[PDB]
Every structure is written in structure tokens, then in C-alpha cells.
Scaffold this active site. Structure first.
Site, PDB file in Angstrom:
ATOM      1  N   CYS A   1       0.824  -1.205   0.000  1.00  0.00           N
ATOM      2  CA  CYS A   1       0.000   0.000   0.000  1.00  0.00           C
ATOM      3  C   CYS A   1       0.856   1.252   0.000  1.00  0.00           C
ATOM      4  O   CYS A   1       0.524   2.238  -0.664  1.00  0.00           O
ATOM      5  CB  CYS A   1      -0.913   0.018   1.225  1.00  0.00           C
TER       6      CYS A   1
ATOM      7  N   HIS B   1      -2.152   2.081   7.010  1.00  0.00           N
ATOM      8  CA  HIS B   1      -2.517   1.907   5.612  1.00  0.00           C
ATOM      9  C   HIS B   1      -2.228   3.217   4.891  1.00  0.00           C
ATOM     10  O   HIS B   1      -2.427   4.288   5.465  1.00  0.00           O
ATOM     11  CB  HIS B   1      -3.990   1.533   5.513  1.00  0.00           C
TER      12      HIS B   1
ATOM     13  N   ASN C   1      -8.642   3.627  -2.435  1.00  0.00           N
ATOM     14  CA  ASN C   1      -8.014   2.451  -1.846  1.00  0.00           C
ATOM     15  C   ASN C   1      -7.388   1.605  -2.950  1.00  0.00           C
ATOM     16  O   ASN C   1      -7.694   1.774  -4.133  1.00  0.00           O
ATOM     17  CB  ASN C   1      -9.049   1.629  -1.058  1.00  0.00           C
TER      18      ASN C   1
HETATM   19  C1  L4F Z   1      -0.424  -1.545   3.472  1.00  0.00           C
HETATM   20  C2  L4F Z   1      -1.729  -1.394   4.276  1.00  0.00           C
HETATM   21  S1  L4F Z   1      -2.768  -2.874   4.028  1.00  0.00           S
HETATM   22  O1  L4F Z   1      -2.023  -3.936   3.399  1.00  0.00           O
HETATM   23  O2  L4F Z   1      -3.814  -2.662   3.063  1.00  0.00           O
HETATM   24  C3  L4F Z   1      -3.329  -3.462   5.643  1.00  0.00           C
HETATM   25  C4  L4F Z   1      -4.405  -2.874   6.277  1.00  0.00           C
HETATM   26  C5  L4F Z   1      -4.807  -3.342   7.516  1.00  0.00           C
HETATM   27  C6  L4F Z   1      -4.129  -4.386   8.117  1.00  0.00           C
HETATM   28  C7  L4F Z   1      -3.048  -4.965   7.483  1.00  0.00           C
HETATM   29  C8  L4F Z   1      -2.645  -4.505   6.240  1.00  0.00           C
HETATM   30  C9  L4F Z   1       0.784  -1.907   4.337  1.00  0.00           C
HETATM   31  C10 L4F Z   1       0.581  -3.207   5.097  1.00  0.00           C
HETATM   32  C11 L4F Z   1       1.865  -3.575   5.845  1.00  0.00           C
HETATM   33  C12 L4F Z   1       1.661  -4.764   6.779  1.00  0.00           C
HETATM   34  C13 L4F Z   1       1.876  -4.609   8.130  1.00  0.00           C
HETATM   35  C14 L4F Z   1       1.690  -5.678   8.978  1.00  0.00           C
HETATM   36  C15 L4F Z   1       1.294  -6.901   8.469  1.00  0.00           C
HETATM   37  C16 L4F Z   1       1.076  -7.055   7.116  1.00  0.00           C
HETATM   38  C17 L4F Z   1       1.262  -5.982   6.268  1.00  0.00           C
HETATM   39  N1  L4F Z   1       0.987  -0.888   5.342  1.00  0.00           N
HETATM   40  C18 L4F Z   1       2.216  -0.104   5.303  1.00  0.00           C
HETATM   41  O3  L4F Z   1       3.024  -0.305   4.472  1.00  0.00           O
HETATM   42  C19 L4F Z   1       2.453   0.961   6.379  1.00  0.00           C
HETATM   43  C20 L4F Z   1       2.538   2.330   5.760  1.00  0.00           C
HETATM   44  C21 L4F Z   1       2.464   3.434   6.812  1.00  0.00           C
HETATM   45  C22 L4F Z   1       3.591   4.180   7.115  1.00  0.00           C
HETATM   46  C23 L4F Z   1       3.523   5.180   8.064  1.00  0.00           C
HETATM   47  C24 L4F Z   1       2.333   5.434   8.715  1.00  0.00           C
HETATM   48  C25 L4F Z   1       1.208   4.691   8.419  1.00  0.00           C
HETATM   49  C26 L4F Z   1       1.277   3.685   7.465  1.00  0.00           C
HETATM   50  N2  L4F Z   1       3.707   0.596   7.005  1.00  0.00           N
HETATM   51  C27 L4F Z   1       3.679  -0.460   8.010  1.00  0.00           C
HETATM   52  O4  L4F Z   1       2.663  -0.976   8.299  1.00  0.00           O
HETATM   53  N3  L4F Z   1       4.930  -0.869   8.682  1.00  0.00           N
HETATM   54  C28 L4F Z   1       6.207  -0.345   8.400  1.00  0.00           C
HETATM   55  C29 L4F Z   1       7.043  -1.477   7.802  1.00  0.00           C
HETATM   56  N4  L4F Z   1       7.137  -2.577   8.656  1.00  0.00           N
HETATM   57  C30 L4F Z   1       7.743  -3.515   8.076  1.00  0.00           C
HETATM   58  C31 L4F Z   1       8.093  -4.640   9.056  1.00  0.00           C
HETATM   59  O5  L4F Z   1       7.600  -5.857   8.529  1.00  0.00           O
HETATM   60  C32 L4F Z   1       6.902  -6.680   9.437  1.00  0.00           C
HETATM   61  O6  L4F Z   1       7.163  -6.663  10.587  1.00  0.00           O
HETATM   62  C33 L4F Z   1       5.791  -7.630   8.932  1.00  0.00           C
HETATM   63  C34 L4F Z   1       5.644  -8.889   9.501  1.00  0.00           C
HETATM   64  C35 L4F Z   1       4.641  -9.748   9.046  1.00  0.00           C
HETATM   65  C36 L4F Z   1       3.795  -9.351   8.026  1.00  0.00           C
HETATM   66  N5  L4F Z   1       2.745 -10.250   7.549  1.00  0.00           N
HETATM   67  C37 L4F Z   1       2.862 -10.872   6.459  1.00  0.00           C
HETATM   68  N6  L4F Z   1       4.057 -10.712   5.642  1.00  0.00           N
HETATM   69  N7  L4F Z   1       1.801 -11.758   6.007  1.00  0.00           N
HETATM   70  C38 L4F Z   1       3.946  -8.091   7.461  1.00  0.00           C
HETATM   71  C39 L4F Z   1       4.945  -7.230   7.913  1.00  0.00           C
HETATM   72  C40 L4F Z   1       5.912  -3.023   9.149  1.00  0.00           C
HETATM   73  C41 L4F Z   1       5.046  -1.878   9.667  1.00  0.00           C
END
Ligand code: L4F
Length: 255
Positions: free
Chosen positions: A30, A200, A220
Site C-alpha cells: 500500500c 494503511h 483504496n
Molecule cells: C499496506 C496497508 S494494508 O495492506 O492494506 C493493511 C491494512 C490493515 C491491516 C493490514 C494490512 C501496508 C501493510 C503492511 C503490513 C503490516 C503488517 C502486516 C502485514 C502488512 N501498510 C504499510 O506499508 C504501512 C505504511 C504506513 C507508514 C507510516 C504510517 C502509516 C502507514 N507501514 C507499516 O505498516 N509498517 C512499516 C514497515 N514494517 C515492516 C516490518 O515488517 C513486518 O514486521 C511484517 C511482519 C509480518 C507481516 N505479515 C505478512 N508478511 N503476512 C507483514 C509485515 C511493518 C510496519
């Protein structure tokens, strides 16, 4: 000065990427899609529809590296726009579209909705950074790069974010997803129930008022059968779920 409602799709009717809804698939990309959608819109706006290209989510997801985050495990919008100004991004459309240099390689899926595609899973391994264009794509990978002049934060102010969209086009934002958001169909989303799921990152492309409730118009990236044809509206003016706190944008370089 600012209008009570604005819709980028109506302001720039010859820019078809503004209307287009993507699907990040079973990958947490995302953060990349919010950027490349807003960048694709601004390039068309910057050139008055003479250049209308889908910038590649794949290029940003696979080639940014540690600076952006960890690929399909999530990343950081501010750092994605910075990569656009440093190394640039090539073109590429939807999964198996054979459009552009590097079309998206992660297949689409169903995001908390019923459909004919496989349901989304947690199978997100970040694909390899392949600096080669699709076979038969005429420009080389180097020549197909699109660069940003700059990237910047927009302040946590409703009027500044509106002014930014109004003058420069759609922006990337970020907000906290609570579980009641997953069931959104229509109207103006306001969080009322459910636990925090994660952050997200999305594309904000306008604003309005619906039944007295001010809102942001947001794209989205969960395909078109999610929500309101892929778009949603979220409460505006109260930093609701942090929607006004993480807005980022940037200006394209010409050509
Ligand atoms: C997109 C949002 S989404 O996919 O549509 C979503 C919505 C609700 C719930 C889950 C996903 C991504 C999703 C990342 C994610 C996080 C946890 C688990 C799965 C996927 N969101 C982001 O990229 C956000 C962006 C953001 C930045 C600043 C402020 C708000 C939002 N960043 C984020 O979540 N981060 C930063 C990067 N980190 C990376 C570390 O990786 C992990 O620990 C990890 C472990 C396990 C998983 N699960 C799977 N691979 N199945 C994912 C990530 C994580 C937190």
C-alpha cells in the site's frame, strides 16, 4: 477561496489514471501504490494530459530497498517519494496487463469481500529488483524512468492539504485501520468499533460534504469490488485516524 467540494477526476477529465483503482494483491505494498498512483496523476496534470502513464508499483516495491522499508511487509510513503526524486520510476500497469516497462507481478485477490478471485492471504515475499523492461517494450529501462523534482510533507492542516490537492493534484496519505473499516461500503467512514489493525497508505484526491459530514475522497488499492467501487470517504477536519497527519507529495520533473 477553496470550493466546498473538489474532485480531481472532474478537474482533470483527460487524465484516466485518476479514475483507476489498483489491487496490491497479497502483498503489503500500500505504501508504494499510494505513491505511484499520486505520481501518475501528477505527471498527467503537470503535462496537461500529454503524458498519461501508469507509474510502476513494481519498480518502487522491488528497487527501493531498506530506505523505504521492507517491501511486501510494509514501508514508508515519505521515503517512497524520495526514491522517485533520486532514482526515478519506470512505467507499468496492472497484473498481466503487458502495459509499460514493469507491470505488477503480484496477482489480484479479494480484500474482505466475496468475489471470483482468490481471497487475499499473507503470502508477501518482495520480488527481485529486475532492472529490465518487459519483452517488446520499446524504451529501455533507463530511458523509461520518470523523476521527481522534490518530495515534501504537507502540514497536518485541513486547509493546507486541500490547497495542495487543489493546486498540485492528488497526494499520498496514511491512516490507522480499525476493523470496522474493513466492512466499508458507502457514506463517510468514522471509526466506531473494533481493534487497531495497522497502518494503511492511500491516495487522497478530493473532498466534499455528505449529509452535513465533511469528508476526504480517497482511493483504496483493494480492487474495485471493495468499498464504493474501490473508493471510500473518510471524516475530514479532525485528523480522524491520523488521516491528516502523514500527507506527502512532490512535483514531477518534465520528461
Ligand atoms: C499496506 C496497508 S494494508 O495492506 O492494506 C493493511 C491494512 C490493515 C491491516 C493490514 C494490512 C501496508 C501493510 C503492511 C503490513 C503490516 C503488517 C502486516 C502485514 C502488512 N501498510 C504499510 O506499508 C504501512 C505504511 C504506513 C507508514 C507510516 C504510517 C502509516 C502507514 N507501514 C507499516 O505498516 N509498517 C512499516 C514497515 N514494517 C515492516 C516490518 O515488517 C513486518 O514486521 C511484517 C511482519 C509480518 C507481516 N505479515 C505478512 N508478511 N503476512 C507483514 C509485515 C511493518 C510496519
Amino acid at each position: 477561496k477553496l470550493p466546498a467540494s473538489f474532485d480531481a477526476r472532474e478537474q482533470w477529465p483527460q487524465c484516466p489514471t485518476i479514475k483507476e483503482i489498483r489491487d496490491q494483491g497479497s502483498c503489503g505494498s500500500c505504501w508504494a501504490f499510494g505513491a505511484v498512483e499520486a505520481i501518475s496523476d501528477r505527471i498527467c496534470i503537470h503535462t496537461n494530459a500529454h503524458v498519461s502513464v501508469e507509474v510502476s508499483a513494481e519498480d518502487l516495491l522491488t528497487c527501493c530497498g531498506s530506505m523505504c522499508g521492507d517491501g511486501c511487509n510494509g514501508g514508508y510513503p515519505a521515503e517512497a517519494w524520495n526514491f522517485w526524486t533520486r532514482k526515478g520510476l519506470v512505467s507499468g500497469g496492472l497484473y498481466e496487463s503487458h502495459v509499460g516497462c514493469r507491470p505488477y507481478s503480484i496477482p489480484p485477490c479479494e480484500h474482505h469481500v466475496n468475489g471470483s478471485r482468490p481471497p487475499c492471504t499473507g503470502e508477501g515475499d518482495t520480488p527481485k529488483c529486475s532492472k529490465i523492461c518487459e519483452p517488446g517494450y520499446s524504451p529501455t529501462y533507463k530511458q523509461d524512468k520518470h523523476y521527481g523534482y522534490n518530495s515534501y510533507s504537507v502540514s497536518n492542516s485541513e486547509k493546507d492539504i486541500m490547497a495542495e490537492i487543489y493546486k498540485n493534484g492528488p497526494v499520498e496519505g496514511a491512516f490507522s485501520v480499525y476493523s470496522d473499516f474493513l466492512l466499508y461500503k458507502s457514506g463517510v467512514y468514522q471509526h466506531v468499533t473494533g481493534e487497531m489493525m495497522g497502518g494503511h497508505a492511500i491516495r487522497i484526491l478530493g473532498w466534499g460534504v455528505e449529509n452535513g459530514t465533511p469528508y476526504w475522497l480517497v482511493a483504496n488499492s483493494w480492487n474495485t469490488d471493495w468499498g464504493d467501487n474501490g473508493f471510500f470517504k473518510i471524516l475530514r477536519g479532525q485528523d480522524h485516524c491520523g488521516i491528516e497527519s502523514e500527507v506527502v507529495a512532490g512535483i514531477p520533473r518534465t520528461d
